[PDB]
Ligand binder design. Structure first.
Ligand SMILES: NCCCCC[C@@H](CS)C(=O)O
Ligand SMILES: C[As](C)(=O)[O-]
Ligand SMILES: [Zn+2]
Ligand SMILES: [Zn+2]
Ligand SMILES: [Zn+2]
Length: 304
């Protein structure tokens, strides 16, 4: 049984993507952008009402297996969209004018592993040459200063950059989709946990983006908006100085593709439960995050 207020295993989320798409045909369509190392279909949900030349926002969750609240948020967003469409003026205008590509779980193999063998697994589950150690850090596997800093060359490490950029089937599929739909995608949003932060390019080097002032003010207003609900405190800024250097990020690569609005979200909390955030906090976490996400969405729509 699927529930937005609890963590659902992969068998359930997969079924959920098919059921939610069938229950909302005028608003949701589903497709597979590729398959994982273990051959699992990487599902993508296109949320929005059909229209001509609609701009789009790309959001993905579950890059890292153990960050369960991340997976739960993507589902929650879809929940909000279909529930409030028509009653809430902002969400209705968002879905009416632009499309939302929601990728529920990128690292499916890792997610499954966290449910069956190791709750704290982070990387993918592909193999590595010359060792029995498994996995690559998908957020260190993109072509952006790839493997130069804040990422390890040791395949037995949790931030292993992989054998080459896009060496992972999952990251290659994500990069390909965005590359194929670059002219329509105006914003890239990637959901993680935790440390409560809103980061923007870059993390692979200590440098700032062309529209630094704009992203900084947007991140600042988004954080302020999130705090309005429960007073949850978030920090924000360029990845390198706000959290730490970390080359190979999808947010940086996306931005370097030309997507001016690229943000990485580190959801609740600040370490009390860490990755094992209680299911009792799912509602509050997702509801406050919706405020930040919709604030960014509104800004994007208004500055096309
Ligand atoms: N593109 C890097 C953004 C800053 C780090 C995010 C963090 C999320 S867990 C990580 O993946 O280490
Ligand atoms: C505190 As962390 C490993 O979710 O960047
Ligand atoms: Zn993460
Ligand atoms: Zn994190
Ligand atoms: Zn709500």
């Amino acid at each position: 049984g699927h529930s937005y207020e609890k963590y659902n295993n992969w068998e359930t989320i997969e079924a959920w993507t098919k059921q939610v798409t069938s229950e909302n045909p005028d608003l949701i369509s589903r497709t597979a952008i590729g398959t994982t190392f273990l051959g699992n279909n990487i599902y993508l949900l296109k949320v929005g009402k059909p229209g001509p030349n609609k701009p789009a926002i790309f959001m993905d969750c579950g890059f890292h297996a153990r960050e369960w609240i991340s997976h739960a948020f993507c589902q929650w967003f879809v929940r909000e969209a279909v529930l409030t469409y028509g009653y809430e003026s902002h969400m209705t205008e968002f879905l009416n004018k632009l499309d939302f590509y929601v990728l529920p779980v990128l690292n499916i193999d890792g997610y499954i592993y966290t449910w069956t063998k190791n709750r704290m697994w982070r990387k993918t589950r592909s193999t590595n040459a010359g060792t029995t150690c498994i996995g690559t850090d998908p957020n260190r596997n993109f072509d952006a200063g790839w493997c130069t800093t804040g990422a390890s060359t040791d395949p037995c490490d949790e931030t292993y950059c992989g054998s080459a950029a896009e060496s992972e089937k999952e990251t290659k599929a994500l990069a390909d989709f965005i590359r194929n739909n670059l002219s329509s995608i105006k914003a890239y949003l990637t959901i993680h946990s935790y440390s409560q932060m809103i980061l923007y390019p870059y993390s692979y080097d200590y440098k700032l983006p062309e529209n630094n002032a704009e992203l900084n003010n947007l991140a600042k207003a988004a954080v302020k908006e999130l705090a309005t609900l429960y007073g949850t405190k978030y920090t924000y800024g360029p990845g390198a100085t706000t959290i730490y250097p970390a080359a190979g990020g999808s947010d940086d690569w996306a931005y370097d593709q030309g997507i001016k609005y690229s943000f990485t979200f580190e959801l609740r909390d600040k370490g009390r439960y860490g990755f094992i955030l209680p299911e009792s906090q799912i509602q509050a976490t997702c509801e406050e995050t919706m405020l930040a996400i919709k604030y960014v969405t509104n800004y994007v729509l208004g500055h096309l």
